[PDB]
Design a protein around this nucleic acid. Sequence first.
DNA 1: TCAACTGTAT
DNA 2: TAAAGAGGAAGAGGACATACAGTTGA
RNA 3: ACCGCAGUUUGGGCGGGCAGCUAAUUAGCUUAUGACUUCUAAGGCUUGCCUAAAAAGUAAGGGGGAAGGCGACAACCCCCAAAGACCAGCCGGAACUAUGGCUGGCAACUAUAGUUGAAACUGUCCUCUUCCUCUUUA
Lengths: 579, 105
Amino acid sequence: MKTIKIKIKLTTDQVQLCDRYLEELTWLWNLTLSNQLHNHCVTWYAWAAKLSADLDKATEKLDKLKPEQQQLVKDYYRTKDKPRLTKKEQELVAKFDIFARWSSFSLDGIIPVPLRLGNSGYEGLSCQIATGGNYWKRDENINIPINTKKGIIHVKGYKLVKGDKLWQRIEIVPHKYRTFPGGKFEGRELTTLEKLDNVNGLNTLRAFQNLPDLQVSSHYIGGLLAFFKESWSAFLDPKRMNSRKPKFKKDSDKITTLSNNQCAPNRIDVNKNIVTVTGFSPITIIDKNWVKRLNLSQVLPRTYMLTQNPSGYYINIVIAHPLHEEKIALVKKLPKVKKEFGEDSQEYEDIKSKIKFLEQQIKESSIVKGKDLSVGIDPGVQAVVSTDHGALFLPNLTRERVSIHIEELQSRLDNAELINDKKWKSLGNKTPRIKTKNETKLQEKISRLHERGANSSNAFNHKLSTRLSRTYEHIAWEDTQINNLGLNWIMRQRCLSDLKAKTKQKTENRGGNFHEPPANYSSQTCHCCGQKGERRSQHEFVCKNSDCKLFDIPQQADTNAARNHKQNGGFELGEVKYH
Amino acid sequence: KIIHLTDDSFDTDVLKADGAILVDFWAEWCGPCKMIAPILDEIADEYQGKLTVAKLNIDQNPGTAPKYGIRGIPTLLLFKNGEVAATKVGALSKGQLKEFLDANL
DNA sequence: TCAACTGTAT
DNA sequence: TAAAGAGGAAGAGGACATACAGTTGA
RNA sequence: ACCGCAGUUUGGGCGGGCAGCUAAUUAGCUUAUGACUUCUAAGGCUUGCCUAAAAAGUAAGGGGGAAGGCGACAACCCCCAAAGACCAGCCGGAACUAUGGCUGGCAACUAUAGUUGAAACUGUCCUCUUCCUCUUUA
């Protein structure tokens, strides 16, 4: 899969239509989020019931085993301190791990109220009771010498602070699905988010809320619903610990992209440079290399996006190998045959054979015979990547200047804002101030500089990754981030993780191999001896033992680490090096 | 072992009583509340003397919960001679409550 | 009369 | 030099990039 | 330096580009995280003259007319030119230097022979974290 980004020009009326569509999609996103939060309770209840059953089974199997070990096992979790047990008891401890998190409960006599979520989907849930009244707020005047694990630290205390209203209890009541007020689907329950894919019901809801009917097409509705489905799935997955509940979008955080994940562009006229997509009159293209990049005579457009960026308006077209189409055509048939013939039928096996065959065809469609060269790569402080043969690649030094320019422009903008606010207050008005034209221009400039920095870094990373992928077939990559324990400011401008990911993907696509050796003892070890050497400078290294061939010979530390990574990768060649 | 609290005596029992008192706000029709009750009983028996613990049914002492900024159950308030030393909301897991108390004590 | 749009299924 | 707020951006890091029935309509 | 424009970036291309030194308004060297117009809070020398945050604006291919702009300038009209610079193979451990060389063809510029015509591009969403600026306290 690839994405082609083509600049387009829109007329004023088209811009107004785009703004209206984005407002509509923001409203849809908020509605879907509210509905999903209201519904999460029904999933939580089933989860709790299953957990209770599991706890009961664990309790039964823990009691049924012999009393001698069960007491110590119970204590193992029933006590902060944990001793070194034997394998016998440790096995049972693992087998009843669940007690580490919870202890058996009933969950009977409950009534299924709508829960209020916190920072996770499973733990920390609560049932609301009341609204209004004073609330706890941090008071920095209160210093509490809290004896945390790090000793005494003077944390800011909390105190009760002015309330919004008089305290009032909420009317407890079970959960109830919400439904479309009227129209052709009156009374339908919105069990899932996919039930919101209907234009009719959404129009009915808007009428209930006294808003004008929707004008956006159903394709962008589907795209936004896809985005929300992704974010919610990430939220509920335990394996990801950084994905949390989706947030509500305020007026200053409107959606900035229209997504069509149902059909390619309706028309792509290359001779006159025109693109016809749904919901707009034909859009002109102001791009000069779009016909060569898109390469319509050998690819297959699938989906697209109208994107807005400080540089202008773009259309993203996603393209794939020509075979992709049948693969999907077969994939979407799998649920049918499974429902119709069962997974043991011969049809099921034949379909899997055909999927595999097409997937293999696609994969081999982009394999290139190589020269079987192996490389060790080490991210550096002075050089973005050092290589086993002594190559040091300079970083994207240009972006530091953009960052400094952003610093200065932000300083200017904030100074202007402070002076304007003071003059506003002096005149005697209490209403919030309205932003000025110079401030808007300066803010646009800052936005454009951020974009330019991001784009420059992305372009540099693509170029370097392509270079490495073309030159080398086997790549070893490991990063010694111990230095982190301004350096952070410099490293945030290099984008090492993106570089690594791009190189990984491109090397895999060409048919190479990508390894990630462990990092233990990589920077200080004499790679030709394995002994811990010494450094006589910020970047030089010398081996210690006299038996070394390179004894008393200073060498580049980055080259040493790169060669160590090459060895740990298993290639062990290290034949030559430049300086 | 857990002491059961009432509105009428809350001030003396919680505010005048010596030592730290962990008060849990409770109801019976609540799900997560039944999830965490066993943990509170555990903490009652592990930390004896180092901490005292109390339970307050909101459905029988409706006045107390508003007075202390509580808007949903379950909630845990750690008091120390008339002021809440610590506050937490939502069904913590066993470990979470354990290190919470460890840090606060 | 065929493109385009919407509804249903996962 | 330090720490907490408010607001504006970005980087990490994981997924993702639909097919058929039925209806419109000019 | 920087800014605008060439799909997005780098080297380059056309244009805008403070102040000082030297030579003869226009050519060189140093150099600014853009340049210029209008009006003003403030500040400086001595009643006048200067420097100016903010605010609102102007242009950013070359030449000639031209309504109208307080002005930078310019709607509109005529001529000239056209750089994120061509294509296809084959070498390269491709760094220093944001990709070097050979072959063939095709363009443009010079004296039939020479010079130039460089590289890459997979984006979007979401959530956490980091950066920056400005405040307030210490």
